[PDB]
Structures are given as structure tokens and as C-alpha cells.
Amino acid sequence: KVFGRCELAAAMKRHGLDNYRGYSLGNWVCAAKFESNFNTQATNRNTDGSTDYGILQINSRWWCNDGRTPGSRNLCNIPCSALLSSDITASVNCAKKIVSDGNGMNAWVAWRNRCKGTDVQAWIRGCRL
């Protein structure tokens, strides 16, 4: 499922991501924009042989299990394919552990490179929330 901007914002707010670890809703939305383009089915292989999965491009080396990644930890205890669902629940719960793991939203290199420090509130402009 390809979410609309305000669609994902409302879902993320409902799952308690707004202000989680102090990161406003615009940050999480911006991150989803530049990680997946709001597409829950997005997958992307990385050079170390891991893959990133779903709306927030969560990595198979540490967080979910895809059966093919050397050194998998599966810290979210979840098949990576569950992060590709139109229900964002599993993706949201896992993002909570990742952003709590020590270096904040810097884990997300599209966030870091394209959202961090910018006018992220723009990413929820016009939304009824």
C-alpha cells in the first residue's frame, strides 16, 4: 500500500510515534517519504548483503529476519516480510526499538541526509490531526 502523506501522519500519530524519543510527527513522515516514498512494499538490498524493508526501510542485519542476511540478530523478533504489510503496526513497534537503541533517528540515513535539521513540520501541513 502506498500511503498518502496525511494518511500516514494520522496512522503514525495513532500508533504513538509523534514526539516518540522527542521526534515530532513531521520527522517520522519526512523519514518515511525519503526511505520508501510512503510505499509499504519497498525493499532495497545493501552492499553488506542485508536488505531494508517497508515504510521505514528496516534492516535485515539487526532488526528483522529475511533468511539470507549474514549475522542476522532479528532484534525486533519479526520476519522482514511482516514489515511490508499495509498494516504499519509491526513497522512502528520495530522503529521504536531502533530509535531507542542509542543514536536516535540517525539510524535512518535518508532522514539524516534529507530531514534532519530541515523544516519537517512542512510534512504535516494541511493535515487534520
Swiss-Prot record:
Matching Pfam families: Lys (PF00062)
Principal subcellular localisation of the protein: secreted
Record localization: Secreted
Binding-site residues for substrate, renumbered to this chain: 101
Disulfide bonds: 6-127, 30-115, 64-80, 76-94
GO molecular function: beta-N-acetylglucosaminidase activity; identical protein binding; lysozyme activity
Keyword Magnesium: no
GO biological process: cell wall macromolecule catabolic process; defense response to bacterium; defense response to Gram-negative bacterium; defense response to Gram-positive bacterium; killing of cells of another organism
Active-site residue numbers: 35, 52
Entry's EC annotation: 3.2.1.17
Tissue: In the egg white and polymorphonuclear leukocytes.
Enzyme class name: hydrolase
Keywords: Allergen, Antimicrobial, Bacteriolytic enzyme, Disulfide bond, Glycosidase, Hydrolase, Secreted, Signal
SMART domains noted in UniProt: LYZ1 (SM00263)
CDD domains, alphabetized: LYZ_C
Domain C-type lysozyme: 1-129
A cellular-component GO term for this protein: endoplasmic reticulum
Self-association state and partner proteins as the record states: Monomer.
Protein family: Belongs to the glycosyl hydrolase 22 family.
Family annotation (PANTHER family): LYSOZYME C
Protein name: Lysozyme C
Lineage: Eukaryota, Metazoa, Chordata, Craniata, Vertebrata
Annotated gene: LYZ
